[PDB]
Each structure stands twice: as C-alpha cells, then as structure tokens.
Amino acid sequence: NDTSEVMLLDTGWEFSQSGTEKWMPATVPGTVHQDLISHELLPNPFYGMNEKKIQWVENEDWEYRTSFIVSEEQLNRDGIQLIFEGLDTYADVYLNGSLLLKADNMFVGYTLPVKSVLRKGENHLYIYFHSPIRQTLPQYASNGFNYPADNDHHEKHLSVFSRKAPYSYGWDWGIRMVTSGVWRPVTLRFYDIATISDYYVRQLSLTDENARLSNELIVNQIVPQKIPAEVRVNVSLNGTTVTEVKQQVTLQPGINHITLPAEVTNPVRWMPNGWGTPTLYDFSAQIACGRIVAEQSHRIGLRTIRVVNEKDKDGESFYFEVNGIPMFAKGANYIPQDALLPNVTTERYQTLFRDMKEANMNMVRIWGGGTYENNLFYDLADENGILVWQDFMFACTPYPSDPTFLKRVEAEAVYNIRRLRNHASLAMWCGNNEILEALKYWGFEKKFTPEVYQGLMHGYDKLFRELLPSTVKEFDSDRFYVHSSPYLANWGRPESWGTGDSHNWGVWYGKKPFESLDTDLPRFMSEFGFQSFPEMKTIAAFAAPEDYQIESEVMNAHQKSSIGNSLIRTYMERDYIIPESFEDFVYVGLVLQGQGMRHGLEAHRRNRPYCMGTLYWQLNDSWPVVSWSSIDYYGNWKALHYQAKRAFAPVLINPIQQNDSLSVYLISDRLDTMEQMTLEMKVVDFDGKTLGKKIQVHSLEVPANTSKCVYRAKLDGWLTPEDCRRSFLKLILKDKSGHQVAESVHFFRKTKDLQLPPTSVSYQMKQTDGKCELTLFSSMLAKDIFIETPLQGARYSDNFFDLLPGERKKVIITSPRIKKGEELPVNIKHIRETYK
C-alpha cells in the first residue's frame, strides 16, 4: 500500500512470574493464563473444579520480554513507531532502558514514537504487568465503601476501578479469570515523512441519485522540514474505480488535518441481512511525496441508519430506520467468545457470523460487560449485513466518576469511536447495561449512606449523561447514543413498558409463564432470556460421568446462577414431564428453552409496529457452562438457535392460541408485498390420519414489513378435547400457482398433556468425508427430535423438529472430522422416550 515497512513483534517472547527469575517461552498476542497452561503450570481452567485452583494467578505480577534486530537502514527511516493494539492492563513498557509508557486501559491502543530510543543491532523490550488486584487494593481501601458489583466474584469489588473487561472478574454465566498480557498485536512501523493517524469517511448525504462524502484525514508528519504532498482518495467497487479526487498540500511538522470531498453518483446501497446485498466500496487514501509514503483504506457501506426514539400515543418509540424504511430488528446479545480473548481465532469469528446469518438475524448487541470487539468482528458484521448496537464497557453497577477515572474513559471512548466509526454495520452507541435500572430498582439505597448514594447518582450523570454523549456528538455525530439499556422501562412496572426498550426479565427472574410474552409487550425487546444446560458432549468436556447430576459439585461449578437449576425444573414441570435421567433432563431442557423463547420471538414480531425488535439474551458462551445461550462454547446449536432461525424467517405463519381460540397471523419482513396467496391448514392425528377436511383461505395479501391476522376460529365445535391431545395442525402458505413459501405446525395442548404414541425413529445414512446424509422415518409423530452426535461443532441442516407421521425427512450433518469408513454415531431422542 505504501513505502512503510511493518515488523510484527509476535515471536521470541518469554514470560516470568515476577520475582522468580525463571523465564519460559510465551505466545503473543496471548494471556498469562494461556502461557501457564501451555507449560502445564495451570490445570485446564474449564475442567471440573479447577476454577478455585487457578485464582492465585491474579495476585502475582507478570513480566514479558522480547528482543529484535534493527538494521542501519531501518534506523535511517524518518520515523519508527511501536504500536500496542492492546495491553491488559496496568503495563509498564521498557525499551532499551527507557520507560515508554505506563498503560492503564485494556480498551486503548497506544502508538509510541521510538526511533530515538532504538539501537542498531539488538533491542530489548520488557513489559511489566502489575496485578490488577494488587494495583487497586489501596484504591479500594481509600474508597470507604464497596461498589455493588455482584458479578465481580470476590469480597472486594475491584473491577469498577479498572478499565478492564468486566466479565473477566466473573459473571452469572462466567468463570473468574482475571488475566493479563499483550492481548492484541504489537507492531513496529518504519516509515518516511508521515503516517495517516486516522482516516474517517464521513457521509454528508445519501439519495438514490448521489452519495456525498467527506474524507477526513489526520496526518502526523515526523520530519522538521515542510513537505509538499498530494493527498489522493480512490473509491472503487469490486476493483473498478468509481471516482478519484486529489488535493495539494504542504505538510507541516506534527498534526495535519486534511479534508477531501468525494461523490458517488447512483450509489449502490448497503442493505441489512434479509433486504438485499451488504455492498461495500473500497475507499483508499494515499499521501504522495514526489513515493506513496502513507496509505490507509476502509470498506464503506453507503446507507442511512436512523434510530427513531420519539414520544408517541403509546409512550416513546424505539426502532431502527434503515435506508428510509423501518426495519424490525431480529437478533441477540453477544458476550465474549472466551475467558481468554486472544484464544478466539479468525475461524471462530467467521463461524459465529455464519450462525447469526443462518438464523436470519439482522442485528447484534455487543453487551457492555465484554470488550469493544476486534476489527474482524465489525468487518464480518459489515459483509454479512448485521447491524451492530455497541455498548460502552460499563455493566450492572455504578462506577467511579473522579477526574482520573473519567480521563481513562475519555481515552477509550475517543479511541474506540475513531476505530469503529467507518463500519457500515455500526448502528448506535449505548452508555451502559442496566446501570440506571440498578440505581433505581436494585435496592442500593439500603446499602449505602444517603451521601454516598447521592454521590453515585451525580457520578452516573457525569459519565453517562455528559462525558459519553459529548464524545459521541464530537466524533460520531450522526450516530445515535442512549445513556443506558433499558433507558426507562422496568420489567416489574407495566406503566413503563410503552417507553423505549425493555429487558423483560419477568420471564426467568419473575417466574412468569412464557405465555406472558403474548401480553407483556415492549416497544423494542433489548433483552429477554431463559437458561439451558448444554448438550451432553459439552457437559462431557468438563465433567466425568460420576459428575453427571444437576447438583454435583462439578455441575455446580458450571452453574453461576444460584437460582437457575430450580427455575429450569419449575418451568419444565409446567409444560413437560420431568425425565428421571440426567441425560433426558438435559435434552428436554434444550427443548424447553427453544419452545418458550421462540414463543416470545413470535409475539414480538406479531405485535409490530407497537414492538419493533427483539434481541434475546444471549447468543453465545465464553466457556462450557449452563447459560441463556443459543449456541454453546463449542459452537453446537441448542434447540433455541434452530427455533430462532424459524421464528426469524423473512415470511412466517404464526398460529397463536389463547382463550380456547386460534388465530393465524402472516408476518413478513420482505420489502415486497405478496399477492393472491392461499393459507392451507389441516388437522392430522399422531398416526398420520387427516381429521375432517383441509381448510383453505384464498385471496390473501401479505404486505411488506407487516404482521396481519388472516384467520380466526374457536376450538369448541371444531375439535374435541380428545382431538386436542391427539392431533396437530399443519399450516402451509402458497402463491397463486400452488408453490409453498412457508410452513408451520401447531399443537393445541402442552407437550405433557399430549397423548404421544411410543415410536421408533429409523434412519438410513450415506456417509462420505466431511458429510453424512440421513433419511429419518417414523410411522407416528416423534415430538421435538434431537439427532445427537459425539462430534464437537458438527452442523445440521435441521435439528430439534417434530418428525411428522409417515413423512420422510432428510438431514445433512457436516464436520471436517467426518471420515468415510468411520460410521458417525447417531442417537435420536424424542419426547415420548423420556418417560414410561
């Protein structure tokens, strides 16, 4: 791209527990815990009872060192920068006897001019990582109260003093692994004249006819003379130039601000997943001096995103308008993919986005107890058409608000805003998760003096109502900011539900039935959720067979919700027969979470436009654990993820039964209206015999972006109470010429009340490298079938579905570990098998 040379400092590192003088090979980027694990100096932290056994690490200081060679020629370049994309967290950086930096914020990248400190030949880099526990003990002692951060799993809630990923201190689905290290890459750049410090592509306006952009460059010139230069911006699409602009300047020593307008006529818009292609242009900025001394590019999506948050007849709306069209949000809350962040590989990020795209999602919330994610995450969101709701990294406790603390926060806000603001995917900023809710409703006023409580309330405003919104206004002026989620609505207070976004924890924490999701509607659901144990192959990863009990010491290790096991059983009993065996209980628990949650996803879509989105808690897991996730740590889809896919389908037939009556809604997130449609239904018993006749509803239209009721019928006079326990309703939607565009099945009774027949699911299999193809058959209904295989992360065309009587079903399973001539073990489970 330019004349600079980059040296990756990613080999030859060593580490030491401070004070031991013993050094061993390390892997950078990485973590202290991983380095110890790689030397068998820690047990597998995710196995068994090992959490307590690895806590000692957090009390030690840890040192890292590397050496590297610099040549006479490199030392003669105009400038040389050492760049740390991430240091976790209190890190003193020494090079060649100079203290370069005292780092104090995990979320900040540092760029350090070092030419004057480098030497020809060998150069020595040492980094000292202070324990973030020891570092903040004096700070806590001076504070005179303990912040109410219940998720910080220690007597002393030290997390709040450090700009370090909150979840690292523990969470209610998380292991405590308060780690340290060089967590993102370290690079040396040797260059001439200048670097581009920042390149911002600011969209001024966008119409079907024209996109107007402002290319804003910050150029840091390292030489003392004045340097004539030409700044060039090339805009290309698929390798073909669309427009090119240039500007003559004379670069002054230090910072230069350069602005170049560019326009794209008849722009091809970036669309979100479901509404078209996520088209990305390539914008390249170069600085040319007589040689291209500096270049930087971004992929750019041309679209408008407006968050509409306005007083209205129902309270206060909260929805996303994309390219001028209101878009119903369908997605999930994302947490960190690992207890050890550098262990998350490119392939894991790619697979997680494939999981979101395949489940018909169009939005992800990067929840405030994790990290501002790596550039790759947002690059994947851009190319998959997934909108990103970005929390700042504050969650579930008030935080300090003293000048030094706020200076750290300002540093991370500026850094990460400039880092992320060029992504098409980035849709909004949110100051924190649940802090105002906590301050108002979680009973802190009983835990603190009135004076300390007042201090907390004032401190909330300084950070979330002043500093963060001001920073967004300055650096990302056309993106929405809200101070907290949920900003006003509280789940126990019905009068607040028509006001902005909800975290409806009435289900789960409030013990409310899943049916409450049909009546208790938000303007936008930013969280709701339900736990499940992950499937047996995941349990087997952390537990020996002796430990396969809900309440074994090892299982309780991997359940961080102290009320979770009791809630799961309570809810299961409402709808299912509780199985006697642990393995069957796990299977039904997956079914339960899937069925209950999808009932909610369907209510939210059905109630558009009153409700304009749903983001369930939670997408994913950081380690093998019992949690609210739809995908376990090993990437296995739980039932919930298949159910989410189905409930988020662009066109959905939603039968909803209440008060002994059935309505059927047709729900569409398509941009086009469907005309002359037929809804066809029929009642089929569990033996496959049709009851009565086919019901047909002709001449239906399904307008773009609407939910509409097309059919209502009382059950009384149609089906006997006996019919209701022994049959299901099949529903199909077809176009004028008879082609199927959607299908659904409906049960008229709770599963535990169904008279399911004993039945065998037989299968045929054709296995080749990487692939099994199964054909399943049962002469009778098999309810909520789970096709279980021992291969971690195996992918299925479908799973957790009802196998209908006499209706053959093909299922493809893929995994790089499937070998032709090593038959894939397959175990098919279904509800009736779970009891006698």
Q: Which residues bind ligand IFL (CB under 6 A)?
A: 171-173, 369, 395-396, 433-434, 527, 617, 628
Q: Are 48 and 91 in contact (CB under 8 A)?
A: no
372 binds, among Br ion, ligand IFL, Cl ion, none (CB under 5 to 8 A by kind): none
The backbone torsions φ and ψ at residue 800, rounded to the nearest 5 degrees and listed phi first, read 50, 55
Peptide-bond breaks in the chain following residues (C–N over 2.5 A): 290
312 binds, among ligand IFL, Cl ion, Br ion, none (CB under 5 to 8 A by kind): none
DSSP 374: P
What's the Cα-to-Cα distance from 311 to each of 199, 315, 500, 568, rounded to whole Å?
37, 6, 9, 38
Q: How far apart are the first and last CA of the chain?
A: 69
Site size with Br ion, rule: CB under 5 A? 11
274 binds Br ion (CB under 5 A): yes
Minimal distance, residue 301 CB to Br ion, in Å: 15
Minimal distance, residue 455 CB to Cl ion, in Å: 9
Nearer to ligand IFL, 191 or 367 (CB): 367
What region does 156 belong to: left with phi over 0, alpha with psi -120 to 50, or beta? beta
449 binds, among ligand IFL, Cl ion, Br ion, none (CB under 5 to 8 A by kind): Cl ion
Residue 38 CB neighbour total at 10 angstroms:
14
Binding string, 666-705, against Br ion, x = CB under 5 A?
---x------------------------------------
Cis peptide bond upstream of 519, omega within 30: no
Minimal distance, residue 622 CB to ligand IFL, in Å: 11
Minimal distance, residue 360 CB to Br ion, in Å: 7
Q: Which stretch binds Cl ion (CB under 5 A): 152-160, 443-451, 490-498, 623-631?
A: 443-451
Residue 299 CB neighbour total at 10 angstroms:
18
Residue 287: exposed, middle, or buried by beta-carbon count in 10 A (0-12, 13-18, 19+)? buried
In the structure encoding, which two tokens stand for residue 672, read together? 């086009």
707 binds, among ligand IFL, Cl ion, Br ion, none (CB under 5 to 8 A by kind): none
Nearer to ligand IFL, 136 or 333 (CB): 333
Minimal distance, residue 627 CB to ligand IFL, in Å: 8
Strands 329-334 and 363-366: parallel
Minimal distance, residue 173 CB to ligand IFL, in Å: 6
12 binds Cl ion (CB under 5 A): no
168 binds, among Cl ion, ligand IFL, Br ion, none (CB under 5 to 8 A by kind): none
Residue with nearest beta carbon to Br ion: 274
Minimal distance, residue 316 CB to Cl ion, in Å: 5
User: Which residues in 323-382 contact Br ion (CB under 5 A)?
Assistant: 362
Overall size of the chain counted in residues: 836
Q: Please tell me the distance from the alpha carbon of residue 279 to that of residue 385, in angstroms, as a whole number.
A: 9
The type of residue at 566 is S
Nearer to Br ion, 142 or 240 (CB): 142
Residue 143, classed as helix, strand or coil, is helix
Nearer to Br ion, 166 or 274 (CB): 274
79 binds Br ion (CB under 5 A): yes
Q: Are 572 and 589 in contact (CB under 8 A)?
A: yes
Residue 618, classed as helix, strand or coil, is coil
Q: Which residue in the block uniquely carries the two structure tokens 């929405």?
A: 480
Residue 111: exposed, middle, or buried by beta-carbon count in 10 A (0-12, 13-18, 19+)? middle
Contact pick of 42, 95, 104, 115 for Br ion (by CB under 5 A): 115
What strands lie across the sheet with 795-796, from one edge to the other?
762-768, 771-777, 809-814, 795-796
Contact pick of 113, 254, 261, 494 for Br ion (by CB under 5 A): 113
Contact pick of 31, 81, 422, 504 for Cl ion (by CB under 5 A): 81
656 binds Cl ion (CB under 5 A): yes
Quick one: three-class SS letters along 491-508? CCCHHHCCECCEECCCCC
Q: Please tell me the distance from the alpha carbon of residue 324 to that of residue 21, in angstroms, as a whole number.
A: 63
Residue 448, classed as helix, strand or coil, is coil
Strands 795-796 and 426-430: unpaired
Minimal distance, residue 484 CB to Br ion, in Å: 9
617 binds, among Cl ion, Br ion, ligand IFL, none (CB under 5 to 8 A by kind): ligand IFL
833 binds Cl ion (CB under 5 A): yes
**How much helix, strand and coil, in percent to the nearest 5, is found in the chain?**
25, 35, 40
Residue 793, classed as helix, strand or coil, is coil
Strands 651-658 and 613-616: unpaired
Binding string, 477-496, against Br ion, x = CB under 5 A?
------x-------------
Q: Are 157 and 141 in contact (CB under 8 A)?
A: no
Binding string, 252-271, against Br ion, x = CB under 5 A?
----xx--------------
657 binds Cl ion (CB under 5 A): yes
Nearer to ligand IFL, 164 or 809 (CB): 164
Nearer to ligand IFL, 438 or 664 (CB): 438
145 binds, among ligand IFL, Br ion, Cl ion, none (CB under 5 to 8 A by kind): Cl ion
User: Which residues in 128-147 contact Cl ion (CB under 5 A)?
Assistant: 145
Site size with Cl ion, rule: CB under 5 A? 12
452 binds Cl ion (CB under 5 A): yes
Nearer to Br ion, 115 or 598 (CB): 115
Nearer to ligand IFL, 26 or 395 (CB): 395
User: Which residues in 143-172 contact Cl ion (CB under 5 A)?
Assistant: 145
Minimal distance, residue 590 CB to Cl ion, in Å: 18
Instruction: List Cβ neighbours of 718 (8 Å cut-off, separation of 6 or more).
Output: none
469 binds Br ion (CB under 5 A): yes
396 binds, among Br ion, Cl ion, ligand IFL, none (CB under 5 to 8 A by kind): ligand IFL
Residue 80, classed as helix, strand or coil, is strand
Nearer to Br ion, 249 or 691 (CB): 249
**In sequence order, what DSSP letters do the residues of 808-827 get, joined into one string?**
-EEEEEE-TT--TTS----E
Residues found near Cl ion in the complex (CB under 5 A): 81, 113, 145, 448-449, 452, 656-657, 660, 758, 832-833
Residues found near Br ion in the complex (CB under 5 A): 79, 113, 115, 256-257, 274, 362, 465, 469, 483, 669
